[PDB]
Swiss-Prot record, chain A:
Phenotype for residue 112 to S: In plasmid pYVa127/90
Name this polypeptide is given: Chaperone protein SycT
Subunit structure: Binds to YopT.
Taxonomic source organism: Yersinia enterocolitica
Gene that encodes the chain: sycT
Pfam family, one: CesT
Length: 120, 116
């Protein structure tokens, strides 16, 4: 209801611009080091994605730490973080809290404290 | 709240009927069911809002890259207690019996492949 309508509100609330291609993928930069991409698949599945870079420790990838979960995947020899949920009943307050949780998690995983050694 | 949790219970009641299949529920409201006596899927709800499937994969498996896009919602391979598990979740809201049933079949089919 509908993905576009939701993204349009989202940007407003966060005061960001920001790019969207003819492919309906939305981009926004955070402090110019983080970039999150958002898209909707099958008219239902809202999908977040961000690159984390090289040399991240592995994550066990369990559910229960964030709702919805943030999963650490491997793409092209580097680590990424992604998260998805159904658009049905997703509102602006929740979309925003979610992107905020996602962004905070990316930030912490990129900090030196999250060392390859594990930490450790 | 109470209504969301009742919605989860309602869906489980529908699913077990549709599956015409023995369910167990424990004290924590975890539903279980075996398929052909070696595959066991557990279903629980969190915060009256999220349906979570879980299955043990039974070995410490070849890592999956854990990307999204292959199933909706994704099936994720986690590591728990030194072994691999498969899991998948989605919001309870707007989830009906036919989607629930299809999701469960996709998830079981994937577990089968990964145990092979």
């Amino acid at each position: 209801t509908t993905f576009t309508e939701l993204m349009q509100q989202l940007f407003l609330k966060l005061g960001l611009n920001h790019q969207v291609n003819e492919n309906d993928v939305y981009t926004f930069e955070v402090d110019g080091h983080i970039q999150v991409l958002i898209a909707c698949y099958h008219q239902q599945w809202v999908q977040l994605f961000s690159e984390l870079g090289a040399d991240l420790p592995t994550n066990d990838n369990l559910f229960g730490e964030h709702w919805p979960a943030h999963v650490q995947g491997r793409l092209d020899g580097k680590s990424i973080l992604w998260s998805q949920q159904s658009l049905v009943g997703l509102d602006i307050d929740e979309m925003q809290a979610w992107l905020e949780r996602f962004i905070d998690d990316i930030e912490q995983r990129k900090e030196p404290q999250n060392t390859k050694f594990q930490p450790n």
